[PDB]
Design a protein around this ligand. Structure first.
Ligand SMILES: O=S(=O)(O)c1ccc(Nc2ccc(C(c3ccc(Nc4ccc(S(=O)(=O)O)cc4)cc3)c3ccc(Nc4ccc(S(=O)(=O)O)cc4)cc3)cc2)cc1
Ligand SMILES: O=S(=O)(O)c1ccc(Nc2ccc(C(c3ccc(Nc4ccc(S(=O)(=O)O)cc4)cc3)c3ccc(Nc4ccc(S(=O)(=O)O)cc4)cc3)cc2)cc1
Ligand SMILES: O=S(=O)(O)c1ccc(Nc2ccc(C(c3ccc(Nc4ccc(S(=O)(=O)O)cc4)cc3)c3ccc(Nc4ccc(S(=O)(=O)O)cc4)cc3)cc2)cc1
Ligand SMILES: Nc1nc2c(ncn2[C@@H]2O[C@H](COP(=O)(O)OP(=O)(O)O)[C@@H](O)[C@H]2O)c(=O)[nH]1
Ligand SMILES: Nc1nc2c(ncn2[C@@H]2O[C@H](COP(=O)(O)OP(=O)(O)O)[C@@H](O)[C@H]2O)c(=O)[nH]1
Ligand SMILES: Nc1nc2c(ncn2[C@@H]2O[C@H](COP(=O)(O)OP(=O)(O)O)[C@@H](O)[C@H]2O)c(=O)[nH]1
Ligand SMILES: *[C@@H]1O[C@H](CO)[C@@H](O)[C@H](O)[C@H]1NC(C)=O
Ligand SMILES: *[C@@H]1O[C@H](CO)[C@@H](O)[C@H](O)[C@H]1NC(C)=O
Ligand SMILES: *[C@@H]1O[C@H](CO)[C@@H](O)[C@H](O)[C@H]1NC(C)=O
Ligand SMILES: *[C@@H]1O[C@H](CO)[C@@H](O)[C@H](O)[C@H]1NC(C)=O
Ligand SMILES: *[C@@H]1O[C@H](CO)[C@@H](O)[C@H](O)[C@H]1NC(C)=O
Ligand SMILES: *[C@@H]1O[C@H](CO)[C@@H](O)[C@H](O)[C@H]1NC(C)=O
Ligand SMILES: *[C@@H]1O[C@H](CO)[C@@H](O)[C@H](O)[C@H]1NC(C)=O
Ligand SMILES: *[C@@H]1O[C@H](CO)[C@@H](O)[C@H](O)[C@H]1NC(C)=O
Ligand SMILES: *[C@@H]1O[C@H](CO)[C@@H](O)[C@H](O)[C@H]1NC(C)=O
Ligand SMILES: *[C@@H]1O[C@H](CO)[C@@H](O)[C@H](O)[C@H]1NC(C)=O
Ligand SMILES: [Zn+2]
Ligand SMILES: [Zn+2]
Ligand SMILES: [Zn+2]
Ligand SMILES: [Zn+2]
Ligand SMILES: [Zn+2]
Ligand SMILES: [Zn+2]
Lengths: 553, 553, 553
């Protein structure tokens, strides 16, 4: 089967020289091409994108002078507050220091209504989880009007004390942080950094003037997003410094720069029971005067979380191939649309309701010509298929249903048009109850299938089709049938009953071709009893029943 | 070439009114549509998904009362153990404290068999990397039966001492951690948090009852995954609190909630040489009695790593377009399947082996009618192409191969069927060694290509095709040929040898059309010597050799 | 419309038994299949890939003996330097210690030219942001030739002092770090770790010998990437330990192993004003002799950032379906290419310029036969469409344009070939100024549209087509026209003016079919005045004007 391999199939097509259809086709093609190209370029769907891996190294620089009372102290954001310099860092903005605490008995701080109306109110032997002090069951006069429960704990106890207002280290808004960010795209084998040779050092970040300076003033960070540093400093907070890397690693469009943005990460309206702000407690234990003491510091501040995210794209051929394959089927849109137009306007419904109503749609009736040049309807050749023609009608009846002992003459079928004959070929030129022509005869077939041949040439009384001279010229012309037989077999022998059978079949074939036109219908046609029996009379059989119609398949 | 632009191509098609094929087509279309729709909806392939950036802020709350001996102490997880409150946090569950250590000489702890069988066993001047103590070469009687090597180091040395069992801070399983998680999808410009207004505060996380409370009891964290906190507390561990954000940012299906899950991250069965658990050593140096001392604490505990991951989807038109384009080609499945059925059942092999064996497959022989209505086979018109017809055979022979001095009569070729003639058109109606008809003549062509015309009308002896009256009516009927010529050229001049050549060509064309049927074969047909020379005799040439068959292309 | 549902469309095709085209088709199909398969397998486009979530637990092991002067001390990387063991860790490689500092007056260190040329140079009451010391306005003689400004600060002040060279803790290159890495793919529900049972413990990482040992010597880490640990130790740095997980979670191809790589993350050539290296300052405050003192340590070292990244793939049916759908349209490449070849080589331009120039391209002229068997050109049947035939020419003229009072005879039109007549069907066989035949008559139509019928049988003077006997046999043969009418309607009545109209129309139809061939052109043909008026004379009308050509649609 070598020839089976070497076959090539190509579809049969129909050019149409239509201005409208060609214009529509090209418009739709340009539209699809424009959109797919735009999507590819905008979304960079030709690039295989990779996420980055990041390293952050921060350096906070600030000295705050505090007058605590009176002692003038300096708070350097180099050793006092910054042992961690990386993704996240903390800048202290307030503190509550309790110097020289001794484990002894003292009143508890009156926080959130922590007081007593009577001595018996306090519970002996139970330590409050907030004050973290063991109650002795007595109530001390903490203040003149703010007496609180007696407790044995570190004293003077300050647990529950509110953060000082205004914040002690407000000057922290004047501090600066230098962020060094190293990224890599391991798949693309590309690494870069946010500081490059030839960058200003005295610069400070501004979203317009200095959008690439990695030195940030904290107050500016807060102002850029409408946050009040003075208020946030009191209880603390969490702020995000987002670094976005939208990086194009293609040589012809290379661009890998960071974009800095800011976002408050703590909730401003956190409920008082969910620990608003940001703080931590750390203690330093020291023995003074032979008595173990402890210095406790509750520090409030802003934790800055540096969030680095982004992707790096580089041209990938496989991605482009996949995208093109995905978008290729969209170029059949023109075909789909124009074929749908042809099919819709080829209907007989439009000439009856649409065009009469709208006369601007009349010239869209050429779709009927475009649809006959495009489609060839055919029917399933099932055994029950039969075609019927009546000389008193202009069209043909297809009886695909079975005859339940009912004469074929009395069967509705379904009307179909007679095919237009090839004019070029022709340019070279007592009776039964179901019979209206009077020339039909009872069928000799077995009673069960006798109704197939119970057909007449016409539906109303009149002259039989056999009376026409064309019937004799075509169907009963022994000369013409012999010529057709010789055309099929030039050396045919004109002797015996074989020739009489060959001529009878040719007469049937001739009537069916003459009155059904297409071979598709001529194959399943049914001859009337009149024509059938005239043919048989003029081409008899030596002996035996005529088989009648036999299923072609 | 404006008309070239305005062309529209549409494929020629063939409707088939088949219940089976239409049903199959629609079933396959519904199947493909259902699957593509289901995939789109389930996988959300219309959504452009983005990973999140996260910030975590934790607050551990717990006081553990320890009776160390006797002194009753409190271990507050606010200052003693928690200066870091973010992605990861540590809860101490055990400790080994060595108070008031002095750099002097003392025995080494007997850990992992660290002992001596003799004084000379110990190495002088060498410091063990485990005990971290410089050996003096002597062995001290550390214990009555556990003497160990003498060392100069911090003393009393406790290096290698096992973690106390049961864990001192078992009460840490009753501690609670509040996790505040802020996420953002920077591309989608969406941010949310795990705590929202109107949430219960007294709640504690339960996977069913309170699946959204971000307050977790550590013992519950361990119980939920079948881990024993009491055992893990002895040597420590690492536990993961996974926060999954499967977030849909579309308005009509908006859902962005966290799902909390837990996973032990350290290996339970870590080898003793790979440092099982989690611990760290930290020292506090202080001068006591004028002698520099050091307090060493080895802390065992559980490090909790909060792992936040997830994606946020939002409708993207480009993604939907790409998905639809990818899935469009699957709607040709019905076409592929039904065309394959037609092709397979159109074979002549099925009527010979399949249908006789299986009679339920007989009604699938209409595929032969569907395949003749669908396909038009053609052959490459190469110069070696020739077609041959023998009046004693019912079919035709295509000789695509070359004649190597061998008469065309004696060439196998390959059998092809004679086309069915258009019955509608016809309804209007001494000898050489290779000659079996006796009426053929030697070819006058040059010897090299003389074998082309060495053909007879039949393969077996018999009457020549020329003897039929149809040959004279069609081929030798000067009247008919003149009528055909006039049809082609109405004003043709019937004079000179030009008319005699025009008639000879028409006679050849007529024989070829009559005996090959299709113009495709009639073009490459080969006339027998008998017919050829009868035609030439009745349409002679004034002078010169007859050219013979000439390649149409 | 049940039959409307049960329709199946199949395209009409044309097999071609061509070795070249079949070979090209199969080559292109194999090429496309090979590439799509290769892309699928290489890129694993059948796998839905997921990023990992990671946990890292490190254990650094090293003791460095330092001789500070003389006191011999040990620096253990277990308690002195490592409280953090996770994603990032710090190994100290150098330090500057200032023991027993007292807040008093002293000279400032001469760093970066920090000196005075005169006492008045120093500013009173202003504290330098670098030295962090309040100036008293005087200049102390710090050194014999390096006098610096007087300042009140912690003393002896060492701010700005350069890091010692060579680094004190060079022995840190001999330290080892054990990295335990736990990953998970939450979607795939897969977790693994970098240490598995049966792994060597005494091993140390080597890229070839021990590529999976998670124990790393720091000096080896630096040597592997061409970094000098001795130099980096002086000022410090940041090094990355990248752990890549390319993990295949499919059972038949399961592989999930880590690949370790190293990358310096700090910039080697950082500007001196951008704080090169890595360091931090931490202080320990202690009261000595009743005077508050502070010990300051500036530590230089290398921060190691463990960067874990990777994806885990597992077979997904939806991904495979999407990929196949995307790549399906590429299998029409053979069709596109071969159809383009057929179209290009079917042009009449190739036979005139290409083949004469290049004779190796002659056998590609069969594409003209392949293109006539494949395409059926048609024209839009618009009202202005007209076809014209002149008996003195071999081809046909299509006049699609309007006649602006200009005789149709004098219209250029555009030449088209006359269709090849179905030879099988035929094998069964005083004057106006615009008239060249002399037998045409003035048109009786209204003057506005009178020019349509102003056509002659020929373009040059000569005999009229009507003079041919074929005109009388075909067009004026009342017998033949009656036979055609009877063929259409066998029981037609031959009486009245109706028959005379039926015959006149048939004569028009016969001329148009005889001289235009295709019904497409015969429909829009235009008869000459000579033939038209001869037909009308021999088939007159009782009374009334002849309507003339009427638009078929
Ligand atoms: O992302 S997150 O994870 O959330 C995250 C988490 C944390 C950070 N950064 C960060 C950096 C430093 C500290 C820290 C600290 C301490 C003091 C100040 N300022 C100060 C105030 C007043 C005075 S005063 O007026 O002169 O007094 C002097 C100085 C600023 C910061 C800190 C240090 C030590 C400890 N604990 C400890 C426990 C036991 C022992 S021991 O001795 O027993 O061994 C010793 C120490 C706790 C905190 C905390 C967080 C960033 C991100
Ligand atoms: O993700 S990871 O990266 O893996 C990661 C890593 C770490 C964490 N959290 C975390 C939080 C705190 C500590 C820490 C600590 C200390 C003590 C207790 N409890 C305690 C026990 C007994 C007694 S007692 O009985 O009363 O005695 C009292 C208290 C709990 C925790 C800690 C603090 C300081 C140091 N070092 C240091 C070095 C030099 C100097 S200096 O003075 O020389 O300057 C001062 C201090 C080390 C550890 C460690 C880790 C989370 C995640
Ligand atoms: O990714 S990143 O975020 O960038 C990142 C960030 C950090 C890390 N690791 C890391 C680990 C430890 C330290 C640390 C430290 C201290 C000392 C040595 N060696 C040493 C030298 C000389 C001598 S000597 O010669 O014997 O003297 C003895 C020992 C090594 C490391 C450190 C400890 C404490 C503090 N601060 C503090 C503040 C207030 C108070 S308080 O008392 O006031 O409460 C107490 C303490 C700061 C640093 C720093 C970073 C990894 C990654
Ligand atoms: N289309 C069509 N074909 C028919 C009809 N009647 C007979 N035939 C065909 O013509 C042949 C004639 O068979 P027939 O002469 O009746 O039986 P016979 O005596 O054995 O030759 C059969 O093989 C049928 O296929 C008819 O009414 N319509
Ligand atoms: N198909 C076919 N065509 C033929 C055959 N012989 C001749 N022809 C064609 O008919 C024409 C007749 O040429 P011929 O009369 O032999 O040469 P002439 O004397 O120059 O006219 C040639 O152009 C051929 O194309 C034949 O055997 N088969
Ligand atoms: N193709 C073509 N058709 C024509 C021409 N002239 C007339 N016809 C057609 O033939 C029919 C003859 O109409 P005609 O006899 O002139 O008008 P009548 O007197 O009303 O019958 C019309 O319906 C036209 O469709 C012509 O020149 N070319
Ligand atoms: C920040 O600095 C400016 C200029 O030095 C000063 O005017 C302002 O008061 C400072 N802010 C704080 C909060 O100290
Ligand atoms: C910010 O907060 C402070 C105190 O918290 C307040 O005095 C001030 O009005 C607020 N707004 C601005 C713009 O400073
Ligand atoms: C805080 O929560 C309590 C209940 O725990 C509720 O009564 C109160 O209204 C809440 N306040 C805010 C500001 O959310
Ligand atoms: C946890 O708390 C419950 C109730 O307060 C108590 O019964 C239990 O013993 C506690 N567990 C530990 C380990 O202390
Ligand atoms: C857990 O561990 C402890 C000691 O490690 C042991 O007594 C107990 O049986 C274990 N199981 C449970 C369920 O507590
Ligand atoms: C630990 O590793 C040692 C070898 O270093 C081996 O002999 C021993 O069996 C291992 N034990 C476990 C529990 O893995
Ligand atoms: C590292 O160890 C080797 C062998 O113990 C030694 O030769 C080398 O000097 C050491 N390096 C340093 C910097 O101490
Ligand atoms: C692997 O382990 C064996 C003992 O189990 C040890 O002898 C060998 O040295 C180890 N491999 C290396 C490279 O040290
Ligand atoms: C590394 O640096 C040291 C001092 O920084 C220098 O002596 C040495 O030549 C450098 N190169 C190597 C290979 O050690
Ligand atoms: C550092 O920056 C300064 C300007 O701030 C410039 O003058 C100097 O040349 C730079 N040096 C290097 C090594 O980049
Ligand atoms: Zn009848
Ligand atoms: Zn009848
Ligand atoms: Zn012969
Ligand atoms: Zn012969
Ligand atoms: Zn004329
Ligand atoms: Zn004329």
């Amino acid at each position: 089967s070598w020839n089976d391999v070497f076959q090539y199939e190509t579809n049969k097509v129909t050019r149409i020289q239509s201005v409208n259809y060609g214009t529509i086709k090209w418009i739709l093609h340009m539209t699809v091409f424009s959109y797919v190209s735009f999507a590819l370029m905008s979304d960079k769907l030709y690039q295989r994108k990779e996420p980055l891996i990041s390293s952050v190294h921060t350096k906070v620089k600030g000295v705050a002078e505090v007058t605590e009372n009176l002692v003038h102290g300096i708070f350097d954001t180099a050793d006092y507050t910054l042992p961690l310099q990386g993704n996240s860092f903390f800048v202290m903005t307030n503190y509550l220091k309790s110097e020289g605490q001794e484990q002894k008995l003292c009143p508890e701080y009156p926080s959130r209504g922590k007081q007593c109306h009577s001595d018996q109110g306090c519970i002996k032997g139970w330590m409050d989880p907030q004050s973290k002090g063991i109650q002795t069951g007595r109530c001390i006069p903490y203040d003149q009007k703010r007496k609180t429960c007696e407790i044995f704990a570190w004293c003077p106890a300050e647990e529950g004390k509110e953060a000082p207002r205004p914040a002690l280290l407000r000057s922290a808004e004047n501090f600066t942080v230098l962020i060094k960010n190293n990224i890599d795209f391991p798949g693309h084998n590309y690494t870069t950094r946010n500081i490059l040779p030839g960058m200003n050092i005295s610069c400070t970040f501004h979203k317009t003037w200095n959008p690439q300076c990695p030195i940030f003033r904290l107050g500016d960070i807060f102002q850029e997003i409408g946050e009040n540093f003075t208020e946030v400093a009191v209880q603390g907070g969490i702020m995000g410094i987002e670094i976005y890397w939208d990086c194009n690693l293609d040589s012809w469009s290379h661009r890998c720069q960071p974009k800095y943005s800011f976002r408050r990460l703590d909730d401003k309206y956190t409920n008082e029971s969910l620990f608003p702000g940001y703080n931590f407690r750390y203690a330093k234990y020291y023995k003074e005067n032979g008595m173990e003491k402890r210095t406790l510091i509750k520090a409030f501040g802003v934790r800055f979380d540096i969030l680095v995210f982004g992707t790096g794209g580089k041209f990938d051929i496989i991605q482009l191939v996949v995208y093109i394959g995905s978008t290729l089927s969209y170029f059949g849109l023109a075909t789909v649309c124009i074929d749908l137009i042809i099919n819709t306007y080829a209907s007989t419904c439009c000439r009856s309701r649409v065009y009469p109503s709208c006369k601007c749609c009349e010239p869209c009736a050429v779709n009927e010509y475009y649809y006959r040049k495009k489609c060839e309807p055919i029917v399933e050749p099932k055994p029950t298929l039969k075609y019927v023609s009546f000389v008193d009608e202009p069209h043909i009846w297809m009886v695909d249903q079975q005859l339940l002992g009912k004469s074929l003459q009395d069967v509705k079928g379904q009307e179909v048009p007679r095919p237009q004959t090839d004019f070029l070929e022709l340019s070279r030129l007592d009776s039964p109850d179901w019979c209206q022509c009077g020339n039909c005869l009872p069928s000799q077939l077995p009673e069960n299938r006798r109704a197939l041949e119970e057909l007449c040439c016409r539906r109303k009384p009149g002259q039989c089709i056999t009376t026409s001279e064309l019937f004799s010229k075509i169907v009963l012309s022994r000369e013409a049938l012999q010529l057709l037989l010789l055309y099929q077999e030039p050396l045919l022998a004109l002797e015996g009953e074989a020739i009489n059978s060959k001529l009878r079949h040719c007469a049937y074939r001739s009537y069916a071709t003459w009155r059904f036109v297409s071979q598709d219908m001529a194959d399943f046609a049914i001859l009337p009893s009149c024509c059938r029996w005239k043919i048989r009379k003029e081409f008899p059989k030596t002996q035996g029943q005529y088989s009648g119609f036999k299923y072609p398949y």
